[PDB]
Symmetry: none
Subunit: 309 residues, 2 copies
């Protein structure tokens, strides 16, 4: 049986799987956050990608599509018929919640909408281009990527062309209004239940809480320090997908190694579904040396009582 492994990466070498930025810290879940159900950064230990998870950092919270309408009520709004990230048509009958990569939380995502026209004009051997600041609200009835359509807003009011293809590059949040990182959008609107979701995850043992890989992401304006917590770094998603090592129990015991001594600084349960819990009474950053890294030690079971940290 192919042994299960983690890649060998320090905190400074880990990428967030829910927003395309570097990890800032490990962080234990607050008391009020007992269960979560994010859809990016979801992969079982045996290498099954789930939810809206795909392999590339450049796909996380990104999308592609075609501008299909410029709204006159508010000349700052445009409807986009989305595609898959590779540009191919999105088939809503596919067994996924929404096109892979789309945002998996409620918020006002800020980035750039870039448009390169599909054909050249006589006299020009390259296509025309225009790009602009844009906001993508994910908490409204207009965010229906599973129905093939998302609505965006710009600050400019007549420089996206209808029927030309777009790419959205996420940067951060526009503001913290309506930001709830743990509320999954209604990908097909209110008449339809989300389908094919990655399952909820939670500690099942008293005294345990979730261990997150956290990034503090940009904010275009206002006060705030918004956090995006992921269950697995993108590199672990990528590694498990490559390896497809069979899971021998429901819980992999992992230890954070200090390579100067070879000793464990703390231990965690890495559950088969692809998330970790720790025995901790506090919600706070987990301070570790820059050179430390997680290592798989052994398959255990769900009754294992972790050493407090």
């Amino acid at each position: 049986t192919k042994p299960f492994t983690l890649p060998i990466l320090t905190l400074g070498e880990l990428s967030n799987s829910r927003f395309p930025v570097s990890i800032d810290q490990m962080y234990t879940s607050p008391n009020e956050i007992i269960s979560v159900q994010c859809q990016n950064g979801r992969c079982t230990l045996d290498g099954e990608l789930q939810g809206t998870t795909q392999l590339q950092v450049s796909g996380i919270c990104a999308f592609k599509g075609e501008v299909t309408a410029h709204l006159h009520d508010n000349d700052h709004l445009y409807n986009v018929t989305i595609t898959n990230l590779n540009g191919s048509p999105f088939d809503p009958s596919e067994d996924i919640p929404a096109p892979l990569g789309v945002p998996d939380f409620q918020g006002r995502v800020f980035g750039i909408i870039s448009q390169r026209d599909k054909h050249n004009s006589p006299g020009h051997n390259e296509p025309a281009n225009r790009g602009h600041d844009a906001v993508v609200p994910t908490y409204t009835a207009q965010y229906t990527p599973k129905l093939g359509q998302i609505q965006i807003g710009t600050w400019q009011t007549d420089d996206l062309t209808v029927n030309q293809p777009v790419k959205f590059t996420p940067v951060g949040l526009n503001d913290t209004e309506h930001f709830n990182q743990w509320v999954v959008p209604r990908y097909a609107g209110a008449l339809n239940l989300n389908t094919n979701l990655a399952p909820s995850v939670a500690p099942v043992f008293p005294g345990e809480r979730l261990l997150f890989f956290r990034s503090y992401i940009p904010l275009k304006g206002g006060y705030g320090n918004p956090a995006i917590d992921c269950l697995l770094p993108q590199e672990w998603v990528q590694h498990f997908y490559q390896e497809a090592a069979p899971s021998m129990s429901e819980v992999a015991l992992v230890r954070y190694i200090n390579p100067d001594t070879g000793r464990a600084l703390f231990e965690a349960k890495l559950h088969r579904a692809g998330f970790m819990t720790v025995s901790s009474n506090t919600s706070a950053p987990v301070v570790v040396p820059a050179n430390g890294y997680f290592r798989f030690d052994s398959w255990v079971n769900q009754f294992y009582s972790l050493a407090p940290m």
Copy 2:
């Protein structure tokens, strides 16, 4: 911003974009024709060719290919593997509904199939040739140009050579059986939805109807006076493609000018998608002086109430 313009052409100088004949009249749409979706003569005001539209009159309802079979069930039938109009292989993965130029309506198209053999015979410094009357039905399961094949019929029964290249020059309809100018063929047959179609067009304002450029095309036999209505003259397609002027709103207000006075005889909405509507309660020819011509006056919006005509 490059200003949008029309060419300066009278009715007698306009070419149909859906059949390779001269325009006979302008004609307002019947009450039963509220929406259409033709695929030739499709071009946005900013110069994006759409559907099966190409630039040359000689391509409209024409095709090229190779005879690949002579049928014995009915010795009057031949299968043709079609190419692009320039003779290059047709790639069915290309983002178009069918090779550019093919007929975009249901009917029995009459023309000449001409065959010039690919190599010379010893003793002859030029290739052998044969041409014959032919009919191309576009409404049957045998019309599958997007799958690379069209079936034709002749009156002669052994004078097209298998494996030699053909050119179809359209002339008119054979008869009016199965003629419906507004039903788009199933370019890839019944198992496949048409792809990459130019969109449907319709008035969106009460009292308005479509304004067509109409030709009465030849009929090989029987009773009839068949009309082909196009949304844009071929010269407007060609001009918009050359100019690629950005569209400043969804509707260009155009006026039909009487040059003897400089005054407008009527006005129309020229929509961004490339079609016109007028405020009219009747469906009939629009009688104008031979010297009149359309002129772009201003960008307006979709709420503009046209003067009745």
